[PDB]
Structures are given as C-alpha cells and as structure tokens.
Amino acid sequence: MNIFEMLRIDEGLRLKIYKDTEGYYTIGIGHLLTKSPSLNAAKSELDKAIGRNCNGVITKDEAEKLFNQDVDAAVRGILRNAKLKPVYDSLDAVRRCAAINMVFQMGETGVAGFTNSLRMLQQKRWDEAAVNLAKSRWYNQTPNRAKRVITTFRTGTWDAYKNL
Numbered sequence: 001m002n003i004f005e006m007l008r009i010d011e012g013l014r015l016k017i018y019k020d021t022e023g024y025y026t027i028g029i030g031h032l033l034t035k036s037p038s039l040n041a042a043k044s045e046l047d048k049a050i051g052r053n054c055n056g057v058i059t060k061d062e063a064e065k066l067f068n069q070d071v072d073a074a075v076r077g078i079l080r081n082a083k084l085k086p087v088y089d090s091l092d093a094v095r096r097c098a099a100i101n102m103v104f105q106m107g108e109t110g111v112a113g114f115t116n117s118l119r120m121l122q123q124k125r126w127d128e129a130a131v132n133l134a135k136s137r138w139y140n141q142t143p144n145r146a147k148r149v150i151t152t153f154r155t156g157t158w159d160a161y162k163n164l
C-alpha cells in the first residue's frame with residue numbers, strides 16, 4: 001500500500017462530474033471542481049484544469065493526472081504549514097499517508113480545529129490521538145473513511161485497507 005492506493009480506495013474513480021459527500025461538484029479521484037451550485041461553473045473549472053473542452057467527462061489518464069497533482073499539492077501544503085510540518089516530520093511513513101489523506105479530504109483549512117490531535121500525534125500517544133480524532137464533524141460525516149484513517153494513525157499499519 002501507498003498513498004495513491006489508499007486515496008484511490010477512499011475517493012473512488014468516476015470519469016463524469018459527480019457530487020461528493022458534501023454535495024460539491026467533483027470528478028476523477030476526488031478532484032473538487034467547485035463549491036458553487038452551478039454545474040456550468042464546474043464545467044468551466046474542469047475545462048481549465050484539463051486544458052480542453054471536456055463537456056463534463058474526462059479519461060482515466062486525465063483523472064490520474066489530476067490525482068498526481070492533488071496528492072503533490074496535499075504534501076506541499078503540509079510542508080509549507082508551520083503547524084503541520086513538524087508533526088508530519090515526526091511520523092513514520094505509514095502514518096504520513098494518513099496525514100496526507102486528511103489534508104487531501106479537508107484541506108489545510110478543514111484541519112484547523114485539530115490542534116489537540118496534532119499534539120497527541122507529535123507525542124506518539126496513538127490511542128489518545130485516535131479517540132480525539134473521532135470527536136469531529138469529519139468522523140461523524142464520513143465515519144467509515146475516518147475509521148480507516150484513524151486506524152492507520154493508531155497502528156501505523158495498513159490493516160484497515162489491506163482487505164479494502
């Protein structure tokens with residue numbers, strides 16, 4: 001397992017514009033197009049992202065290219081953030097994937113309220129961190145995915161993903 005396989009499991013793959021769990025227009029492997037209610041706005045974002053007139057549909061190669069870009073952006077986001085970088089650097093490779101997963105899903109913004117979880121992770125208090133992470137809108141709104149990510153932080157193994 002690696003971060004691409006993990007996020008592919010969590011995000012799925014769809015080649016036509018769809019609405020994500022929050023109701024936002026998305027495509028490919030969890031590529032958010034816009035939070036605007038306008039499908040036309042989403043189509044325009046898609047054409048800009050891909051560099052051609054897509055009419056709301058892309059190829060698998062194009063989906064995977066956006067995915068590479070999005071994973072890269074998530075990692076860069078972590079490295080540029082003074083609150084996240086030190087915790088990320090303290091983690092082993094498997095737990096780093098769990099961190100990237102969260103940032104991919106919620107952004108640096110959506111992770112703002114996780115100060116206490118960040119501290120517990122930095123302290124390697126894995127069970128405590130796991131309990132804290134579940135006390136979140138994140139956990140309540142996407143509990144199956146959150147449980148997988150939290151298990152990954154708790155154990156430092158891929159046990160939650162190995163079966164899929």
Ligand SMILES: CC[C@@H](C)c1ccccc1
Pocket residue numbers: 078084085087088099100102103111114117118121
């Ligand atoms: C706890 C928030 C998540 C995005 C994280 C965890 C450890 C290091 C960086 C980010």
